[PDB]
């Protein structure tokens, strides 16, 4: 009910359809994606394009919110496991902003073709949250350790042009461009691609949090600053965090 | 008979001389190369330039033999274990085993019309882990995915951008730089090289990696890729 | 008395300024000690961020144990400084106002963020002096300028300019000390716990590595080598060195 699924040549196009929420990921959207990924090429598709309707690729977790629901991360993790395990290369057609879980989604694609007005951001430091290790590692490999530090410690927006610079974007362009590239890739040897992908994803990005990481993570998540962050936003005022 | 070795002051230059096959490696040219690396600084060399004759640095492999992969493996061990900096004068296209060899150099100067490629996904093959890890460290994880999953070329300008090329220039340029390097203190260069090479790229394949590797190599698609080329037609891969 | 560093605070930003401009802010045992102390005691304190910077034309030109009374426990005093920066909950924005060479480049890399002047450069000139680096300096350099350019900096003492610092990501911005402070100010209005978590994970990328056994030997040789002696002679003599590889 919340995604579009089409196929032309051997390219499955999976489209996030919540444009009125900038494709924010609630629980239902996350389940429907997972399913669409697992059932990709049941079936004759050799590649997937993943993209969002409207002006955003994905605005992150739904602030309504599943974002702060306790069993929401597991659905996200299962989504990511499904993409990682799929033998299909996923070309992300990033048609506009990708934030939070939405950045995570974008980075879990195998390749990225990015629209000129799209940007990338982890606003974690504005909301007092904390990321899983994989997000941090993969971001570091895609924009380089220095920019990652700036994105993670200060919520720096990564522009499209700069995403093209560091490698996070492979190409700057449109959905049609992404679909055309996926067509090429769909004509390549699948076993070679499946091998590259698996080895690539096993670069060590996938990392269980160290004990200090887990403690700092929980401490951030169950902090009062989390409340203050959303309140200041809705009240359209600056936050006053207390570090607790 | 297949390589040229010369020396000017402190700099040993090793030139691939199979420009008829665009310097494609085989049984012999690799084994000769291994010796040139070992028997360098035998000798008063403090720096090696590595390069290729004609239009190509090395366009891959051409075995038109059974221990070729061994000889290839030992070649890499040699450049890795070697105590001297190797400036790759990448004079033209560096493809497959050629990109492997170019990456095994400690530094790179790349001719303006040279490019780098792993076309494995056009031929249905798989790479070892080290090639993937090091390519990732040199062109960044993002561009590495595009090279690995889509067989995309890395042009010289982007090689300079990412760090794969330290400079754009000629064999002459490489030699000029290699000479300044020969004047640097060897023990410092040795320690840095060993630690740099030990960044984790020298990695043994995970089980799933090995399953997918063997699967790709023994696939029918590998034949299809070759037969399709010979028939100037598009491949129809089965994924088997 | 007097100090080798200056400490001021504007709102929640603590600016620490290295003040050995006579020596281009070359580190010694006292300066390093004063710096360690200024980092632990920050945010003790209403400060939520640290701007690190150098007085004069250089950020920090490396090391100069010359007049130093306790230059003996300078290597260990240097390890302490790096742990305190790594352990600090405060994000540290280095304002690299000039050349950061050697230990100065190590210090620069231990900062959480870097705002670099247009005339600054970065350099590990260890191959000109025949020394060896610890694994962390090498790993963290690799992450900040990419593996390719890392070999070039380490094997041939290549200078990374401001402009190519921005390119690789070594320099987050090209700006002035004020610019570094305006940015740190913003960061000081962010949520400390999120920052604390990220920094700790980021520093635990693997760059903190114990030397492999083969690494230690090459390091110990390089440092015990005659060429180290030679390279100093050749400089204090004002002439090219003749390195022997021993
Ligand atoms: C093997 C696998 C290896 C990996 C393992 C798994 C890895 C994953 C594991 C993860 C598990 C760990 C924990 C998870 C950690 C991450 C979870 C939290 C991170 C988050 O995503 S939090 C949310 C952050 N996002 C934001 O704050 C978005 C801010 N900006 C915006 O929403 C928008 O302004 C833009 C997206 C930029 C677009 O702007 P615009 O076009 O001007 O639109 P606006 O006028 O602002 O909004 C239009 C309408 O959309 C609505 N909307 C926008 N965003 C959301 C949202 N996120 N949630 C709910 N509603 C949303 C907005 O309210 C508005 O509604 P209207 O007023 O009715 O028109």
């Amino acid at each position: 009910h919340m995604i579009g699924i089409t196929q032309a040549e051997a390219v499955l196009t999976i489209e996030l359809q919540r444009p009125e929420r900038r494709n924010a990921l609630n629980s239902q959207l996350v389940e429907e994606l997972t399913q669409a990924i697992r059932k990709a090429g049941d079936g004759s598709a050799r590649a997937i394009v993943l993209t969002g309707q409207g002006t955003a690729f994905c605005a992150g977790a739904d602030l309504s919110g599943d974002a702060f629901a306790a069993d929401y991360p597991d659905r996200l993790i299962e989504l990511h496991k499904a993409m990682d395990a799929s033998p299909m290369p996923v070309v992300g057609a990033i048609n506009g902003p990708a934030i939070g879980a939405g950045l995570q989604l974008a980075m879990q694609c195998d390749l990225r073709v990015v629209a000129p007005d799209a940007f990338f951001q982890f606003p974690t430091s504005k909301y007092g949250l904390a990321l899983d290790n994989w997000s941090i590692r993969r971001l570091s490999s895609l924009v380089g350790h220095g920019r990652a530090r700036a994105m993670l410690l200060s919520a720096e927006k990564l522009t499209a042009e700069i995403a093209l610079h560091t490698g996070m974007a492979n190409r700057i362009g449109t959905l049609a461009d992404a679909q055309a590239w996926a067509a090429e890739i769909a004509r390549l040897a699948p076993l070679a691609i499946q091998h590259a992908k698996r080895v690539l994803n096993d670069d060590g990005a996938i990392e269980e949090a160290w004990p200090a990481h887990k403690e700092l993570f929980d401490k951030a998540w169950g902090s009062q600053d989390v409340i203050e962050a959303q309140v200041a936003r809705m009240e359209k005022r600056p936050p006053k965090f207390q570090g607790a």
Side-chain angles (χ1 to χ4, degrees), chain A residues 2-8 10-38 40-160 162-229 231-235 237-239 241-244:
Chain A
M2 283 197 301
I3 54 183
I5 301 182
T6 62
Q7 182 166 343
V11 183
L12 200 80
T13 305
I14 302 191
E15 172 181 25
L16 267 51
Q17 303 188 342
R18 297 186 72 199
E20 72 293 345
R21 301 291 183 256
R22 300 315 182 248
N23 300 314
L25 299 184
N26 61 15
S27 288
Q28 196 208 312
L29 178 50
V30 162
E31 152 81 359
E32 289 186 8
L33 253 186
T34 310
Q35 285 306 125
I37 299 294
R38 286 199 180 117
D42 259 338
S44 51
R46 296 287 211 193
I48 301 160
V49 166
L50 167 65
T51 195
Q53 181 171 48
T55 64
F57 171 72
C58 183
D62 201 318
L63 276 350
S64 60
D66 296 18
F68 310 102
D71 61 21
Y72 169 83
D74 292 321
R75 307 168 169 282
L76 234 40
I77 285 165
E78 290 304 314
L79 169 66
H80 281 255
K81 284 158 115 87
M83 293 173 74
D84 162 75
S86 164
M88 323 262 283
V90 178
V91 180
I94 318 308
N95 54 283
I99 327 270
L103 183 32
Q104 289 176 337
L105 188 55
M107 291 193 301
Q108 189 65 249
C109 299
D110 292 296
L111 300 161
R112 278 151 296 271
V113 168
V114 189
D117 293 318
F119 71 86
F120 301 89
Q121 175 191 35
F122 269 135
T124 322
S125 78
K126 300 174 107 199
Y127 297 162
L129 303 180
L131 288 180
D132 62 280
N133 287 46
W134 176 88
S135 276
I136 291 170
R137 304 301 177 217
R138 177 62 63 235
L139 178 74
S140 301
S141 62
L142 289 173
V143 302
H145 188 87
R147 286 175 183 87
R149 296 190 80 97
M151 290 183 76
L152 295 161
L153 303 160
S154 82
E156 182 174 280
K157 294 195 183 181
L158 171 72
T159 67
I162 290 185
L164 172 56
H165 175 105
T166 71
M168 160 77 72
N170 303 87
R171 298 168 180 193
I172 274 181
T174 78
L175 167 56
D177 293 331
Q179 296 172 311
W181 196 14
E184 281 197 4
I185 297 171
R187 293 191 292 274
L188 296 170
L191 295 176
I193 292 162
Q194 291 165 34
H195 175 276
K197 173 167 177 161
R198 171 82 272 123
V199 170
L200 282 157
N201 287 2
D202 293 339
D203 64 339
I206 298 161
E207 179 184 51
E208 202 191 353
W210 303 14
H213 304 171
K214 163 145 169 43
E215 274 174 325
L216 289 160
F217 176 102
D218 303 333
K219 175 151 155 62
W221 277 89
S223 77
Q224 176 69 218
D225 278 337
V226 166
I227 306 308
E228 166 70 14
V231 155
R233 166 178 44 93
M234 296 185 303
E235 288 187 13
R237 63 149 172 105
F241 298 117
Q242 302 278 101

